[PDB]
């Protein structure tokens, strides 16, 4: 009935950010979600999120700083190489100055600029700007 946990996670963050909230509760947690938030937090789009360590799927309470415009997922997780990565940048990011595309390379979850520096592609999860 879910079919995705990262979709409902970024959908809760995107709505709470537009409604002016300061913190958002994410009902399901996963290592892909946590590493996704780290890419946004490392670039200065969210605050210090706290993972509610329950003996279940787990919850996450993210501290919203209002610096985010929108966070979304790209379902399905298409296989993005390095030669076609420039195409996804023009279809998902507002401009070449800011905004990042979260890819899942073989070295782990990272953004599109880190994947280009490491010279490796992978599956795309979503984007944020």
């Amino acid at each position: 009935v879910r079919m995705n946990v990262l979709a409902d996670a970024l959908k809760s963050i995107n709505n709470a950010e537009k409604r002016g909230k300061r913190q958002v509760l994410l009902r399901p947690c996963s290592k892909v979600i946590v590493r996704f938030l780290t890419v946004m937090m490392k670039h200065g789009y969210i605050g210090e999120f706290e993972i509610i360590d329950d003996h279940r799927a787990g919850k996450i309470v993210v501290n919203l700083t209002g610096r985010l415009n929108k966070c979304g997922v790209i379902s399905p997780r298409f296989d993005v190489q390095l030669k076609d990565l420039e195409k996804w940048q023009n279809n998902l990011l507002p401009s070449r100055q800011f905004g990042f595309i979260v890819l899942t390379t073989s070295a782990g979850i990272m953004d599109h600029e880190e994947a280009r520096r490491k010279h490796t592609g992978g599956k795309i999860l979503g984007f944020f700007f």
Partner: protein, 81 residues
Amino acid sequence: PLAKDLLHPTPEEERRRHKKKRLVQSPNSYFMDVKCPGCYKITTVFSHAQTVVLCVGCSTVLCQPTGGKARLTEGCSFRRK
């Protein structure tokens, strides 16, 4: 209600909301050691007993089956905690 702190909620809001919509799920029911004048031993019984509960020796009835928690008879103790 925009900057409502979610990671440190008040103990009243946690007790009021649903048993599943909390930060960490917790049962709302409890166990109690009914002490009838017949049996002198402590016999734990679920709140929603759902069945005719009897102590050791079968002296008297403890709980009549109801929709929610058990309807205790006259002369019953509490959780004793």
